[PDB]
């Protein structure tokens, strides 16, 4: 029953409420492969509490796989702690969570991975974000991003 890796994400968001935050450290990235957005919304806050005593690079490596369920405020907070999030992780973030981010905040989030943002300018999260930004603000990234 529970010995299989797909077990965790076979449970509904309602059932996943009872999962104790003290378990989250043993949850491997493999276990979250089959988890929908409604389930990550329930698991992320439990990951937040389970890892909150950690900081920077050590915190990010642990929270990475759960950031799908992270709201805007937590992404803003993450940008301040000079964490260098890779573009593949950023492209899996929920659209609603990314849109309100500023040019400065996205550049701090991605660090040197911002250099690859031109190739994703038409793709799901980044496209939506670009359409809400002033072209003059996009110009400062030095990528030649278009459509503000």
């Amino acid at each position: 029953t529970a010995f299989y890796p797909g077990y965790l994400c076979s449970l509904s968001p309602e059932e996943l409420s009872s999962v104790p935050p003290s378990s989250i450290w043993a949850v491997r990235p493999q276990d979250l492969d089959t988890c929908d957005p409604r389930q990550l919304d329930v698991l992320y806050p439990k990951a937040r509490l389970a890892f909150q005593n950690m900081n920077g690079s050590e915190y990010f490596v642990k929270i990475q796989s759960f950031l799908g369920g992270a709201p805007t405020e937590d992404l803003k907070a993450l940008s301040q702690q000079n964490v260098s999030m890779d573009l593949a992780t950023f492209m899996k973030l929920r659209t609603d969570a990314v849109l309100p981010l500023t040019v400065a905040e996205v550049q701090k989030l991605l660090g040197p991975h911002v250099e690859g943002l031109k190739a994703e300018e038409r793709h799901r999260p980044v496209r939506d974000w670009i359409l809400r930004q002033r072209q003059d603000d996009l110009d400062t990234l030095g990528l030649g991003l278009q459509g503000g």
């Epitope: 299989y4 929908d36 573009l87 492209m91 793709h123």
Partner: single-chain antibody, 230 residues
């Protein structure tokens, strides 16, 4: 792999309602929202009609709906049209093998997102082969790639799945060690590979993009690659 049971055939007159049932176990259909439905017309790639029991992708009429009760999912088509005449496949995610599974298929009788696969292939038994599939108009690393084969006149089989991000790869039990699946992230391309072809490898091969949740939620499909071995 084929691990879910459907009836072979279902019939209805225009305007009527029909129901196709799909039966599995607590470790596929039984899992949270773990059923999707694919329509296949003659000579065309499968098309996602329903994911997550009763979610419709945009551009699919409200006439298609689905429900789930224990280990049995069902697809209802109301106000039948001639156009609905097709094969229907349920899929789920088998948590035991950690791979997608298909039903055997049901034949219904009525009384931006682009994946481009290699052209057709004509090979002899014992030769190498590498089929390719190039994605565009979406973030290639944000979605799982799946490989499906149907042998001529037979059902769909999931061969394996790959996360193009980290190249993490899982094969269905029946395709373990028979074939190699890989990704080149930089050119948005996924690959299927044989060391030494047999005659039995003659089939249509489809690449698809999507998520492993909602019983395997693959809304993007290639046109298919025909492989003839004689």
């Amino acid at each position: 792999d084929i691990a879910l049971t459907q009836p072979a055939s279902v019939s209805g007159s225009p305007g009527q309602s029909i129901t196709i049932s799909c039966t599995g176990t607590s470790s596929d259909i039984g899992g949270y929202n773990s059923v999707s439905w694919y329509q296949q017309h003659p000579g065309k790639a499968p098309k996602l009609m329903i994911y997550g029991v009763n979610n419709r992708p945009s551009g699919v009429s409200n006439r298609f709906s689905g429900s789930k009760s224990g280990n049995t999912a069902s697809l209802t088509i109301s106000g039948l049209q001639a156009e609905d005449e097709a094969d229907y496949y349920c899929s789920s995610y088998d948590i035991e093998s950690a791979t997608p599974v298909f039903g055997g298929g049901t034949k219904l009788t009525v009384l931006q997102v682009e994946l481009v696969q290699s052209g057709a292939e004509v090979k002899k038994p014992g030769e190498s082969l590498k089929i390719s599939c190039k994605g565009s108009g979406y973030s290639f690393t944000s979605y799982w790639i799946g490989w499906v084969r149907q042998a001529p006149g037979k059902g769909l089989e999931w061969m394996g799945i790959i996360d193009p991000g980290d190249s993490r790869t899982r094969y269905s039990p029946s395709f373990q060690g028979q074939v190699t699946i890989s990704a080149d992230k930089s050119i948005s391309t996924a690959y299927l590979q044989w060391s030494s072809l047999k005659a039995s490898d003659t089939a249509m091969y489809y690449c698809a993009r999507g998520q492993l949740y909602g019983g395997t939620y693959m809304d993007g499909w290639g046109q298919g690659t025909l492989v003839t071995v004689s």
